[PDB]
Amino acid sequence: XXXXRXXX
Amino acid sequence: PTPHEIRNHLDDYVIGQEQAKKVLAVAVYNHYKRLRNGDTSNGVELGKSNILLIGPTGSGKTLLAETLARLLDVPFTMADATTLTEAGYVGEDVENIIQKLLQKSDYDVQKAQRGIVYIDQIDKISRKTRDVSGEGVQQALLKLIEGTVAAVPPQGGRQQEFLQVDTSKILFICGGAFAGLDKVISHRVETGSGIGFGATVKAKSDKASEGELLAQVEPEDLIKFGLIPEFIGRLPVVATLNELSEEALIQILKEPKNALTKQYQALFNLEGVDLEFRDEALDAIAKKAMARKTGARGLRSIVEAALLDTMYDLPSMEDVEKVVIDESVIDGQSEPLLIY
Amino acid sequence: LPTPHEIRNHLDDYVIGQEQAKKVLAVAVYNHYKRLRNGDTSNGVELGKSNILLIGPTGSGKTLLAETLARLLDVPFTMADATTLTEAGYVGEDVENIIQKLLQKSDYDVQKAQRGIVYIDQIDKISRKSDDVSGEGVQQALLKLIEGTVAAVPPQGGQQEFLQVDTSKILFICGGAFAGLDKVISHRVETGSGIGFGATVKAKSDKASEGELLAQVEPEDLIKFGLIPEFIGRLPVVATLNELSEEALIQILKEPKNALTKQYQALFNLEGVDLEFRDEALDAIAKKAMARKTGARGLRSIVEAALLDTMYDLPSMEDVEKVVIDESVIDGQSEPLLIY
Amino acid sequence: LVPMVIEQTSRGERSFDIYSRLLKERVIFLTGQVEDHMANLIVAQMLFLEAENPEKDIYLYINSPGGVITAGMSIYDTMQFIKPDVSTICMGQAASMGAFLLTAGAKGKRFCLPNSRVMIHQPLGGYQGQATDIEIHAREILKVKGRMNELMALHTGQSLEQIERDTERDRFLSAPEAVEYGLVDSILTHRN
Amino acid sequence: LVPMVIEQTSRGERSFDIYSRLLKERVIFLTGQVEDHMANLIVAQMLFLEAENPEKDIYLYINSPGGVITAGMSIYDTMQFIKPDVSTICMGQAASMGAFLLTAGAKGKRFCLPNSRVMIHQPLGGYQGQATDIEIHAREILKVKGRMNELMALHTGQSLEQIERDTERDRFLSAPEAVEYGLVDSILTHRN
Numbered sequence A: 001x002x003x004x005r006x007x008x
Numbered sequence B: 001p002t003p004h005e006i007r008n009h010l011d012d013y014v015i016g017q018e019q020a021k022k023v024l025a026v027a028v029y030n031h032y033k034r035l036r037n038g039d040t041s042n043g044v045e046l047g048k049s050n051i052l053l054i055g056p057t058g059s060g061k062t063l064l065a066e067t068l069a070r071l072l073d074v075p076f077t078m079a080d081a082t083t084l085t086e087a088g089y090v091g092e093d094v095e096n097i098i099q100k101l102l103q104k105s106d107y108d109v110q111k112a113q114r115g116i117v118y119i120d121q122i123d124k125i126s127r128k129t130r131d132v133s134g135e136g137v138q139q140a141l142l143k144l145i146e147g148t149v150a151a152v153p154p155q156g157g158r159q160q161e162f163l164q165v166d167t168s169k170i171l172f173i174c175g176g177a178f179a180g181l182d183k184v185i186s187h188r189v190e191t192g193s194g195i196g197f198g199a200t201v202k203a204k205s206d207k208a209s210e211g212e213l214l215a216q217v218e219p220e221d222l223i224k225f226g227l228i229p230e231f232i233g234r235l236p237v238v239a240t241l242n243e244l245s246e247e248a249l250i251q252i253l254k255e256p257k258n259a260l261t262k263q264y265q266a267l268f269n270l271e272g273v274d275l276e277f278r279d280e281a282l283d284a285i286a287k288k289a290m291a292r293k294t295g296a297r298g299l300r301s302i303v304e305a306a307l308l309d310t311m312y313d314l315p316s317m318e319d320v321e322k323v324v325i326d327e328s329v330i331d332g333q334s335e336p337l338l339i340y
Numbered sequence C: 001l002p003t004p005h006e007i008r009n010h011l012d013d014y015v016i017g018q019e020q021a022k023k024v025l026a027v028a029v030y031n032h033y034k035r036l037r038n039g040d041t042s043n044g045v046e047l048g049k050s051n052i053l054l055i056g057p058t059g060s061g062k063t064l065l066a067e068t069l070a071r072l073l074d075v076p077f078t079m080a081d082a083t084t085l086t087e088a089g090y091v092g093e094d095v096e097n098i099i100q101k102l103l104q105k106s107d108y109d110v111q112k113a114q115r116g117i118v119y120i121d122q123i124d125k126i127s128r129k130s131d132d133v134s135g136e137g138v139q140q141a142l143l144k145l146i147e148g149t150v151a152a153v154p155p156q157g158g159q160q161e162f163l164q165v166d167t168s169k170i171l172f173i174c175g176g177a178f179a180g181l182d183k184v185i186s187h188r189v190e191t192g193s194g195i196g197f198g199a200t201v202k203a204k205s206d207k208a209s210e211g212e213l214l215a216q217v218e219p220e221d222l223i224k225f226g227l228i229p230e231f232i233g234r235l236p237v238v239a240t241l242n243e244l245s246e247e248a249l250i251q252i253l254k255e256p257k258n259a260l261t262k263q264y265q266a267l268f269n270l271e272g273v274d275l276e277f278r279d280e281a282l283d284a285i286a287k288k289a290m291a292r293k294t295g296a297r298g299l300r301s302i303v304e305a306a307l308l309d310t311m312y313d314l315p316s317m318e319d320v321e322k323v324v325i326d327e328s329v330i331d332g333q334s335e336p337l338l339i340y
Numbered sequence D, E: 001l002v003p004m005v006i007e008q009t010s011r012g013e014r015s016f017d018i019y020s021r022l023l024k025e026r027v028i029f030l031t032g033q034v035e036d037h038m039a040n041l042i043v044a045q046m047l048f049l050e051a052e053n054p055e056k057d058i059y060l061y062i063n064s065p066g067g068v069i070t071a072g073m074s075i076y077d078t079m080q081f082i083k084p085d086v087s088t089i090c091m092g093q094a095a096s097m098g099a100f101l102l103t104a105g106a107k108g109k110r111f112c113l114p115n116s117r118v119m120i121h122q123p124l125g126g127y128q129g130q131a132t133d134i135e136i137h138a139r140e141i142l143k144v145k146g147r148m149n150e151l152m153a154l155h156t157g158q159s160l161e162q163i164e165r166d167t168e169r170d171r172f173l174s175a176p177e178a179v180e181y182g183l184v185d186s187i188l189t190h191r192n
């Protein structure tokens, strides 16, 4: 549904 | 099919793109030239002729496709990839496009294989829980272009029978405004700038404008954007469209029956009042339109922004048989003169 | 079933100017598929795989060798690019996508995708920067992939299941261009020079071929470039393209059956008109190609731009049986001659 | 010693010297006597700014007691060659050669501080040797004096005859008198 | 002090001195007196540019009152040996040796500023010792004078007899006269 993709 | 006649009809509905019309007439004619009597040549692997349109916003891409469908005898489709979800998800699937093509051809396989395909907003599928409208759409479309027979249930399925309609014979027109495609081309063409006396120094913008920048594009430049090289390999043809011309803006408001001037004219004719637009006001509008960098679509802003006071005050006003718009009106310093 | 001599001729038909590269890929692919037919029924078990690593200039036909091979071999092929690749979990990409791409050719492969081939482009872009998600880190992830393993892959995207596919059997061909590698090997093997008086200057930029130096390339030189020796150990086979030649470009348009010159010739055969391409016109295309530093890839732009006027007017024109092209026409100062 | 400053940018923090920070904004400093080394450094700065932007005005602050003539003429020809308008400002003092580069700026973009002072005189020289050699060096310095007066009249607008009489000996000009004399355009008393 | 500049590149930001930035664009500066140290530094710059690109023109800006002859001849032989065309420009002044390196540039790529000045004279020397040693050093400097006049005629196109008469004493040449004299090709008044 919702993708929480984050990279430091 | 005549390249000289197809260009004459498109000239009626489209203006400002002379080079692009020549490209479409050649590619379109080469597409049908192969289907009717082609693939009977001494040399094998005749390259499939395709089209890849590229232009800014309001460049008339939709109009060119539409004008072709009306002129052309076979059917035409307008299938964007904004909602094309792969693997049969809730949004949509690529198979429906094949289905919609048959509806236009009335389940005629012999007539549907000779059809044309056009897609808008192809930049949105550029590769970046899961991704549904990303690079996945390229994979499904890739099979459609390279060539493959698919299975479509006739009438949606009452048996499990499908129609094995070919796809290598159908033409495809991938076109959409590519945002940011100018900085990438700028790096290659600029090749730095000299600092000494003899070396020439570039100004703020001499060759960095959208016009004369896409013609020198290459396939490797699109790879950095996000597209797949195999997808671009199947479309060796490219069509570069100029942003706009000052003279074309004056013609778009006078020759087309759907011009904005004629629209507002009928809006006031029902009220029992006449309207007029002098030539000095038309050319002034074109200078302000190009500054907005939006195209013909952003032309209504300049018109209604000027006729706001003219339309708001109008109903209360009486004995105003005709209204004249002077060049000063576009500037906004002087109000339009009223005729009693 | 095929042999190295038979495949050499087929490769020669579509590729030229690369003799050593043909023998390398021929014996490599020949012995690779021999291992699949025999499997491990012989005394020897777990027959090791031999990978291939190509190094050559840009537009030197590296991709064509892999594409033409897939047509004759008939096995599935994919063209992956390593520029987007990122180090295990970053915004750009993950290695998992590559595995599904190969299956995407047929979308259903259990004992059929193991025998497929894969190509990689721009391998030098991931060189270990020594000042990382772009550098060395990416190479570490590919080690286990090339050595052979199994990755879960949803077939067709969908079941509540995933299919396991081996990758030891799957051969990999890492293609790429290593610019500036001549300086590293020159000081090591031939001579330390280029800056001194007695030292040889780089006068032979185009007079002589850098290729000859690349033939003496070794894995130790690749370590200084940035690659990991462990990564190069998995790819013992080495292929070195020498250069592209002006006379070769003339042969590229005449010797290959799929030459662009022959496509237009076949296009007008059904039309009942003859086509011609003089030798004085092909040499000019070679100069324009080298001028844009693109090779054979930037060839259609020169041809299609020149024949746009002739092709557009050919259907309209009548009683024309032959077309002649001259060197002046390529420059754009002349119009091609027409014979009735 | 030169103080170091930090220019806050989106990419990150960067450390610059006070003179280099102003160079980024198209500002060059002319300090001390005009010599071959100091003059050749300013020329490289002007060319660097030309490539970065040929449409942005350059500002040249001059505080110098003058110096060699040949070193100064290299700067004058550069300002006229490049397309950007080289704005000049006089801080503290502007001697014979400093005044020639001051008035050589773009018309309408020349300023002088309320308490600045300009001084103009004739070229200085000398020679020791045979009489034949003295005549050669005398004719050369005479041409320069005539050439320097011709260009001074061109930018100041005065007549060549007036410049010859005023440059026979040292002549100091206050900031108000310079405006009336055509040497500058206005005075930057306060920031409005 | 040398100002620092930032060269925006795709890889990242880098800090360079004003002299090093121009070196990246095949530009070398010849400032001050010509000596063994300053001359040996310019030679290394030319070779570095040769390796980077042997087909791009090099630009040499000269602002110098001259100096040692042997130091200058090392530069002249280098310009002729390398394949690239060494373009020369005169800024401020060009003395005897500065003029020889100016005219030694590639034909058709020699320029002089509108207010630049060139000066040419004969070699200078001297010796103290026995009469036998004075005769040796006198014959050597005479060969150099003859050799320097022969090469001057080759690039300027004039006759050897004319160079001998014109180089007997100091001779100043304005920018227009240098073009008429074959020393240069044109004048870079404005940027077109």
Ligand SMILES: Nc1ncnc2c1ncn2[C@@H]1O[C@H](COP(=O)(O)OP(=O)(O)OP(O)(O)=S)[C@@H](O)[C@H]1O
Binding pocket: B013, B014, B015, B016, B056, B057, B058, B059, B060, B061, B062, B063, B120, B177, B252, B296, B297
């Ligand atoms: N070539 C053209 N000639 C005449 N009118 C045009 C032309 N292009 C655009 N217009 C006008 O602008 C309107 C919108 O044009 P569109 O073709 O829809 O713009 P567009 O750039 O194709 O939109 P996108 O970017 O594909 S969503 C048309 O209904 C016309 O009124």
Ligand SMILES: Nc1ncnc2c1ncn2[C@@H]1O[C@H](COP(=O)(O)OP(=O)(O)O)[C@@H](O)[C@H]1O
Binding pocket: C014, C015, C016, C017, C056, C057, C058, C059, C060, C061, C062, C063, C064, C121, C175, C177, C252, C256, C296, C297
């Ligand atoms: N021998 C050849 N015959 C015909 N075309 C060639 C040949 N060599 C290269 N090409 C052209 O080069 C293109 C492929 O270039 P490619 O090998 O992908 O470059 P790179 O080596 O940088 O990957 C193809 O479009 C093909 O037409």
